Amino acid sequence: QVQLVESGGGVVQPGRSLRLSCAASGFAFNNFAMHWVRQAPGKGLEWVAVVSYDGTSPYYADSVKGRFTISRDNSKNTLYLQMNSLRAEDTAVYYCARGLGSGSYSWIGYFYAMDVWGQGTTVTVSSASTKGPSVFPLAPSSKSTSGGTAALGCLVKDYFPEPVTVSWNSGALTSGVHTFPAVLQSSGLYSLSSVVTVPSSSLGTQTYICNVNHKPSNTKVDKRVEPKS
Amino acid sequence: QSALTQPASVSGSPGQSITISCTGTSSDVGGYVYVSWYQQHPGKAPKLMIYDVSNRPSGVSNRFSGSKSGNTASLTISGLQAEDEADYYCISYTDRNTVVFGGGTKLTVLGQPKAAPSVTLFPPSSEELQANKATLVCLISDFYPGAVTVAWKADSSPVKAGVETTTPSKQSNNKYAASSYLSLTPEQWKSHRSYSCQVTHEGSTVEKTVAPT
Amino acid sequence: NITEEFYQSTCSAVSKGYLSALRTGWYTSVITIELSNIKENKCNGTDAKVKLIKQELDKYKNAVTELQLLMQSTPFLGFLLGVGSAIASGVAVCKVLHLEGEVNKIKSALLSTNKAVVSLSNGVSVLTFKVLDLKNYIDKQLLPILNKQSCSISNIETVIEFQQKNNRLLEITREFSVNAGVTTPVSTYMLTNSELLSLINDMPITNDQKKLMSNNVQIVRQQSYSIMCIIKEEVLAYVVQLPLYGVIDTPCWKLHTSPLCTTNTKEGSNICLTRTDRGWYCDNAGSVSFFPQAETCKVQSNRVFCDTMNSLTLPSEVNLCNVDIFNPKYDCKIMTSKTDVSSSVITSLGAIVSCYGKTKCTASNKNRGIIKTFSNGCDYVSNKGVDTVSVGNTLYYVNKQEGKSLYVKGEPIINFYDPLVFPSDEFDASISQVNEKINQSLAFIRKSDELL
Ligand SMILES: *[C@@H]1O[C@H](CO)[C@@H](O)[C@H](O)[C@H]1NC(C)=O
Ligand SMILES: *[C@@H]1O[C@H](CO)[C@@H](O)[C@H](O)[C@H]1NC(C)=O
CATH class of the missing domain: 2.60.40.10 (Immunoglobulins)
Structure with missing residues (x-):
């Protein structure tokens, strides 16, 4: 079986070094080229580096040259990727891919493509410690409410790590509810917001409370969402 | 590159x-x-x-x-x-x-059929301003397919600082939904005429507007 | 300063004042060229510039194939010398380069720099020098231009630039192909003057040794070997074997000898004697290094470059043959004959003339013409004021090197022997051998009268 298994998906603070490991089996490793391809959360793919059949001639991406160094060990059928001075933009899933073209060739153009891919290890850089969240009520605008369908929700801001759960009315309201994906802000803390679609005529009769539960930090806060004048 | x-x-x-x-x-x-x-x-x-x-x-x-x-x-x-x-x-x-x-x-x-996006702008809550912070929340929901582009504007000039956008995810009714956050300061929120969220989906454009008043 | 002494008694002359530079060991360096793995080019481009690049690439590919064929094969008193294996040291280092992963070490060691010290598996440290990187050039400058979908070359300079870079590879293979992978002297294609000077400067040797080699690079080249070793895993490697000069600045002298014959008018009644121990002599570690094949030493001004492989190690008493050929401490080597033919020996600072029979022997000046006519016997003239010497139909030019000559007067020793018991058939004899032969002839005459 032709498989590539990378491991070592730990956490590391910015500015520190990290070394990626990718194992190989089921094929002549000392005859193919190896690629590194990372993918930011939600964003597209990004080429990183390539090493030839014997690790003599490497090639790096312009956004990466100088910081990362890629090596190969044929005696162990293993591929490596050294990473120094890690910054926040390095948060990505680093895939381990093979080259397209067996042979003792040294030019990147002879194996620019990728045919066999690994599973990928999530590499996360963050200097933030475990912190509790902060819920802010996303109230509906009294002027924009008289329209039939209303909109309100909660705002879970600045928490770490992931994930966080949010229910409504202790789990009684599930119709028209949608919790969004979390986003990592510039400070390194995640932010999240969940909202519901509410009938406009019952905005003063009903109580709307989101049950935000952050189990990693042992924080469970309920915030009541009400209109304002 | x-x-x-x-x-x-x-x-x-x-x-x-x-x-x-x-x-x-x-x-x-x-x-x-x-x-x-x-x-x-x-x-x-x-x-x-x-x-x-x-x-x-x-x-x-x-x-x-x-x-x-x-x-x-x-x-x-x-x-x-x-x-x-x-x-x-x-x-x-x-x-x-x-x-x-x-x-x-x-x-x-x-x-599915082509679903027009419904957007809603959220000014900074009365409790968030007490923390020396401010965050405008623009939420796109009930659109199809899952691909929208978000643009922010202060008065008439666009804004690109402190903006975050989530990947369009599916809802409980097989419709896609996206978010957008504009992290600002209490001074930046009060010292502007109007903040707008300009959402574009399949050519058409929907734009809401909020103001401190 | 250079001086010379002629000994009339033995028809010989010694030139002194020279300083030694004796090769005593070998330094082995591994020179590598990084080659590019070039696959097929599927364009039938008839662009005039693509055609020239493709022709140059065929020469490149044929050179690599040629060298791969080569790497499959394993690369008077002269007769007293031993027999060495001149490249035994270089070839030994080359054998190690054929072991698994040994080439990979040099290659990865030279990834960041073009000069590094690599420790081989056996433990020996060798300087490794990358003199040409064709892998980098081909992969970074010419692969994109040839493989373009358009399949045409923008400008003339890329074709020309590749020919310049590739030329060195073509010339190195050419030399190795006609020398079975071992060349000497080491040409400038194998190692440029800059690379060699840099290699000498990075060698683990004294500062005096570095200076001597740098100021005499042309002699270093002639005493060096380049041994084609391996071409595998995109690396061409050959071993350059440089001389180590372990003996420097000791006194050396050159012994010149010429036949010494009697001068009777009766044609064949004459006997002759020639000192056979001519050649170079250098003081060395308490003994004297004697180089019988004087053509194996190169004289540069007053420095003599010799190779100890072509030497004997003699006791210092060998020098006594110059002042007293009959000394009891060293058996001076001589040959004997009855061939009283005329000839001249051009020395460092003059000319010995062995003039016999009816031969016309003269010495001339360029301005005044003939200034001395030689008589029968062995004689000598200094190079001061003399430009040429003639012995029969042979004109000799004399060396115009500056230096003083001394004429040491003495009775020609050939007169001391009785021809009836003189052994005149010795090709490889000595003072003592002639003595014991004379007594064996005299005892056969003495023990006959003992009966009477
Ligand atoms: C030349 O001069 C040096 C320096 O004094 C001396 O050692 C050497 O013996 C001289 N040459 C001869 C032939 O004596
Ligand atoms: C001739 O002389 C040598 C040395 O002088 C001597 O050893 C030898 O015995 C002599 N010959 C005879 C026949 O005695």
């Missing part, structure tokens, strides 16, 4: 044919045959579909075809299926001895 120009969204129906663009320069695409295409299902690693301009490996069907004219490579999927709804990328040798990827294209097979 300068990225390759790919259309963000591409829509299609089962049985039809569609084409994805991949525009480069004379160095990357419009100069060499070394251009490949990749299909990536969410969760699983990418998979090679077309290597070189038109060649394909064993396993992929006759429905995937590749071509190239000028500085643009084209991937054609004849007779769409539900199994084809995934992201598609294009790579190319860059003449500068590296490899560059494309922007990415989310191909969606239409199993």
